[PDB]
Symmetry: C4
Subunit: 337 residues, 4 copies
C-alpha cells in the first residue's frame, strides 16, 4: 500500500476489515444525506488566498480550552476502536502523544479510562460522556477522568436515542462499566434536559463542551449553563439524517456565542483545506472521527500517526498557500460560500 491522503486510508480499510465492521464505522443514518453533505459542503466554501505574505515559518500550534496543541486538528470520540486494531484506543493515544495533539476518548471505548491515561500519560486527553440513566456510573466516569488527568468533559447532547444506521441492521451486526441501537435504548437516558447539564456543571470543575449542537439558540443556552465550549457536530451524520453539514451551521453558532466560549467542528474533515475553512469561519479546532479508525485499520499506532501527519502537512500547505503564517491570522475573508 501507498496511502498518501485520507481517502486512500478509507479505501485500504474497506479492503482489510470485515464488511460489518467497515459498515459500522462508515455508516450514517437512514439515507445518509447528511453523511454526503458533511463532505460536499466543504467543497462549496471557496478559498480566497492572499499572496506574498512570508510563509517561511508556518506555525500550526494553537490551544484547546487552555491547553497547547501542535495543530488545530484533534482526535474525536469513535467507539470500539479495538474492532479496527488489537491495540485500539491505546494505539490512538500513543499517536496523539507523538503528534502533540489531543484525544477525545469515547464513553464506549474498548479500553478503560485508567488503561488509556497509562498508555498516554503525557498526551492531552479528554473524556466524551453520555448522561446514563444510571447517574452513579456517570459520576464514577467523571471522577475517574479527573483522577486520571483528563482535561475536559465533552458531553454528547444529540443522542437521546441512537440513530438508525441501516447497514448495522442489514449486516447481522466496552471496558468502562442493531445491538447498538438496543444497547442505547437500555443505558442512555432519553429524558436528559438542561437541568441535567446544571447537574453535570456542579459535578465537575473540568471544562465541559456541549457536543452535537446545531442551533444558535441551543449554543446560547449552553453558554448560559456555564459550559466552556460548543462542538458543532451532527455526530458524524449518524443521528438525525437531513440536518445540515457542520461547516454550514458553524458560522451561525460562532455568531450566537459572541466569543464567550471556544467553538469546535467535526463531521467531514478529510483534508487540510477543510481545517483551514473551519478556522476561517471561527472554529478554534476541528476533530476527526473516521480517518483515525482507518489509520488504526491500516497499522495501529503508526497508521493513526500517518493519518494525523498527512492532515498536519496538508493544513500547513493550505495555510502557506493562503498567506497564513500562524492560526491567529486565519480570517473570515479567506472563505466565501
Amino acid at each position: 500500500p501507498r496511502l498518501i491522503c485520507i481517502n486512500d486510508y478509507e479505501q485500504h480499510a474497506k479492503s482489510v476489515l470485515p464488511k460489518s465492521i467497515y459498515d459500522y464505522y462508515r455508516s450514517g443514518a437512514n439515507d445518509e444525506e447528511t453523511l454526503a453533505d458533511n463532505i460536499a459542503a466543504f467543497s462549496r466554501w471557496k478559498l480566497y488566498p492572499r499572496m506574498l505574505r512570508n510563509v517561511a515559518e508556518t506555525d500550526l500550534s494553537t490551544s484547546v480550552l487552555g491547553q497547547r496543541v501542535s495543530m488545530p486538528i484533534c482526535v474525536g470520540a469513535t467507539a470500539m476502536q479495538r474492532m479496527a486494531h488489537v491495540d485500539g484506543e491505546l494505539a490512538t493515544v500513543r499517536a496523539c502523544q507523538s503528534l502533540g495533539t489531543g484525544m477525545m476518548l469515547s464513553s464506549w471505548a474498548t479500553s478503560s479510562i485508567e488503561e488509556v491515561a497509562e498508555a498516554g500519560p503525557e498526551a492531552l486527553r479528554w473524556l466524551q460522556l453520555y448522561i446514563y440513566k444510571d447517574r452513579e456510573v456517570t459520576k464514577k466516569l467523571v471522577r475517574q477522568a479527573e483522577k486520571m488527568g483528563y482535561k475536559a468533559i465533552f458531553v454528547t447532547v444529540d443522542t437521546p436515542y441512537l440513530g438508525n444506521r441501516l447497514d448495522d441492521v442489514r449486516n447481522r451486526f466496552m471496558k468502562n462499566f442493531s445491538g447498538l441501537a438496543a444497547y442505547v435504548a437500555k443505558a442512555i437516558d432519553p429524558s436528559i434536559s438542561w437541568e441535567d447539564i446544571k447537574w453535570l456543571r456542579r459535578l465537575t470543575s473540568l471544562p465541559i463542551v456541549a457536543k452535537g449542537i446545531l442551533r444558535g439558540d441551543d449554543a446560547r443556552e449552553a453558554v448560559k449553563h456555564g459550559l466552556n465550549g460548543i462542538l458543532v457536530s451532527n455526530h458524524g451524520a449518524r443521528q438525525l439524517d437531513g440536518v445540515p453539514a457542520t461547516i454550514d451551521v458553524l458560522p451561525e453558532i460562532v455568531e450566537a456565542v459572541e466569543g464567550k466560549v471556544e467553538v469546535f467542528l467535526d463531521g467531514g474533515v478529510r483534508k487540510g483545506t477543510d481545517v483551514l475553512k473551519a478556522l476561517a469561519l471561527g472554529a478554534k479546532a476541528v476533530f476527526v472521527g473516521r480517518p483515525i479508525v482507518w489509520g488504526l485499520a491500516f497499522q495501529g499506532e503508526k497508521g493513526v500517526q500517518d493519518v494525523l501527519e498527512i492532515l498536519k502537512e496538508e493544513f500547513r500547505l493550505a495555510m502557506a498557500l493562503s498567506g497564513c503564517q500562524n492560526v491567529k491570522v486565519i480570517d473570515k475573508t479567506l472563505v466565501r460560500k
Copy 2:
C-alpha cells in the same frame, strides 16, 4: 426478505409483481419530473434539531378533522389494491384498524364501501370521491359512505382527465358501480367547477377535503365554499407533470388558509423525517400512497402493518432526535430550505 425501510418494500414489490402491475403503481405522468421531485424536495428541506428537551415519552397522537389517530400518518387512496394482494383494501383497512390510523378508500377500489366498513368496523375510514358525469351514482356513493360510518369525503379536484402515464400505454395495460385513461374519459366529468363543489357541500354534512390543490388562491376558494380541509397533492405526480413537489407548495397553502381549515400533504412520503418536515411546515397529517401498495405486495395486511409501523417508528425517532415530545411542539424553526 429483510425489509427495514420503505424503499426495501418497493424493491421487493418490483421483484414479485408483474411489470404491468408494478409500473401501474410506480408510474408518474409523462417524463416523471414531478415524481422525482416529490422525493428530492424533501431532501432540500434541512432539519435544525433542538437538544436536551426530554423526549422519554414521545406521543405521536393527533387528530384528523376531529377524529383521534395514533400518528399523523394515514393511508391515501390508491385504486385497485387487489392487483397487489388477494385481500386488497380489506387487508389495508384491517392494518389501519390495528395501527389506530385512518384509511382513505379510493372510488376505484376492488372492494365495496360496505365490504371495507365490515372488514374494518372500528377503523377510521374516509371516502375519496370523484364527481362523475352521473351525479346519481356520485350521490349514491356519498350516501353509502355516510351510512357505513365513513367520517369524511376527500373530493379529488385535479383529475378532469387522467394524466398520461407512458408505461401503462407501453405495457399492454372496480367493485362500487391506457384502458384507465379511456375509463376516465367515459366516467369522470371534465366540466366540474366550483358550482359542483357547492352542490357536494349541500349534499352532505360530512367533512369535505379538497384533494389536489396546488395554489393558494384555489385553497382560499375551497375555504370560501365551506370545505373543511385541503390535501396538498399532485396526485402522486400522475396528473400534470412539471408541477412542484407538494412539500414545496405546502407553506404557500398553509399561509393562504390562515388557519381556517386543516392542511394535509401527500406525495413522496417515504421516511419519518418526511412526516416531521411536513408537520413543521404546518400540515396536520400526511397520507402515504405507494408505500401501502408495496406493503400489500409483500404480505397483505401484515405487509401494510409493517410499512405503517416502520413509518411510525421512523417518525418517533425523528421527533425524539429533534427535541419534540409530541406533535403540538413541532414548529416552523425545525426546518429551513
Copy 3:
C-alpha cells in the same frame, strides 16, 4: 414500433437513419451546452395549475400574424428534409394542411417554393429567408413566395456564418437556386445589418418576423424597423453555443416589445407542457424543428402527422389539467422558475 411521445420518434430515427444524417439533424454547436439547456430549461419552469375551471370543451385554436391555426404549434424551418424521407417537404406540408397548422419552409429546402405550394395549396405556409450576398436571388425568393401564397417571411438574423457542428466535420458529411459550413461561407452574407432589414421591409408588404433574436434591445430594434414579430430562437442551439435556452430569454423579449408584435419561440419543444409554459410566458405560438424530421424518418407525411397529433393531444391535456379552456386564458401565474 410503438411511438407514443416525441422522444420515441427520435430514438426510432436514430435506429433507421445513417449516422451522418441523424447527426446532421440532432447536432448542436461545439460542446452542445445550449442544446442540452433548451430542454433542461423547460423542466426548471414549474406549473401552478388551477382546479375546477370547466375544461370539457378545450379549444386549442389561435392565430399567427392574423391567420387562424388549429393549435399554437407550428412547423419550423429545417433544411434538406428529403434526407429523412423521399417526399421531404411535400410530406411535411401535407401533414400541416391535415392538422390545420402552418409550415415554415427553409431556404435550403430539397423542394421548390412552387412544388411545396402545390403539394399544400390550402396549408398555411411561410418562407424562412436568408439575406444572400446575391440580393437578386434573395428578391426572387420573396417574389416567388408572394406569388405562391406564402403569408409571411421569417428572416433568419443569427447566421452571418454557420455554427461549428463538430459531428458534421467528424462524420465525412437544394431545389430553390462541413460542406454546409463551406456552402454558407460562399452564399450567406456576413455583412447583413439593420440597413438590410430596411431594404427587406421596403421589398415586401408580407409580414416579416425576425428569427434568432436573443436580446431585448435587438427585439426593440426589430419593432422600430417595422417588423411584425420576433421568433425567439437560438437556431436549435446550432449557432453560438453557450447562449441561454429560448424559454429563459422569452420573458425579457416579451417585456421589451410591449405588445407591439407577436413573439414566438422555438428550441427544445418536445412536450405539450413545453407549449403551455411558452404561452404562459407570452409567446403566441411555438415552432418545432427536429421532432418533424423524426416524424419524416419514421413514415413521411403520416409520421409528421403523428408527431403533430401527439403534440396537439399533450397540449390539450396540459391545458385541461391546468384549468385552461382556451389559449386566451393561459396566464403568467401558471408558471414560476
Copy 4:
C-alpha cells in the same frame, strides 16, 4: 488522427504520452475541485449575442503591454515542454512567431532563454519568473531576458511552496541554471513578500505582471507597487485546491484595478467562447497552458500551430456570431452568469 477541437488534442496526448508525463501535465492539486471548476465556470456564463452588426471583416488583433498580437490568445508558461516533444519550447516559440502571438517562457523550461530567443527572434516573448532563494540567479535570469529581447516579466506569486498533485506522488514521477515538490522546497523562496516585489520593480524597467492573483486587495497592492498588469490565475488549479475558477474572480479583479493596468486570465481556456467571455468581463487577453502541451505531444511546432489556429478560428466565429467586428466592441452586456 482527425483533431478538430482542443479536447481532441488532449485525448490524443493521453493515447501517446507515458501515463506519468500525461498526469504531470493534466493534474491539479488534491481532489482537483478547482481543475474541474476552471472549465465548468465558463459554461455558467451565458452569451447574449447581438444580431445584424456587420461582421464581414472580423479583426482579432489587440495588444498586450503595448505590443501588437494577432489575437487575444497567448501561450502561458508550462514547464518542461521537451517531455511532450523533442523540440519542446523551440517548437512552441516557432508556432507563436507563425501565429503572431506571444509566448510566456517558464522559468523551469527544458530550453535556455538564449536558445528560445534564437529559435523565435521575431516572436513576442515574455519570461515567467520565480523569486528564488538565490537572488543572484533571479537577477541573472532578468538580465538575460532583457538582453535576449523578452518584453515583460511575469512574476509568479502563488507558489511559496508547490501544490500537492497526487498523481505525481502516486506515479513514481531545466536548461536555465513528487521530485518537483522537493525541487521547489529547495530553490523557491517561501519568504517572498511585497518587499521582494519592490526589489524586482527596481531591478528592471521591463513591464512586470503579477501572475496568480485571486483577490481584489492583492490586485490593488500590485498596482501600488508599480506593476503593469495582473494575470488572474490559480496556476492551472495546481496550487491551492478549492479556490474559485479564474473566470469567476476576474470581474472582482477588473473592478479593483480601476483600469490602471491590463488584466489577463488563464485557467480552463479551451474554446473560442471562453476567450470571448473573458474579454467581455474585461480581460485584455487570455493565456493557454495545457492545450499547447497537447499540441506538442501531437506534432511539435505543427501541433502547437494547429491548437492556436483552432482557438483563433473558434474565437473569430464566436465574435462574429455575437456581433463583434473587433475586440474593442466586446462589451460586458454580452455575458450574464
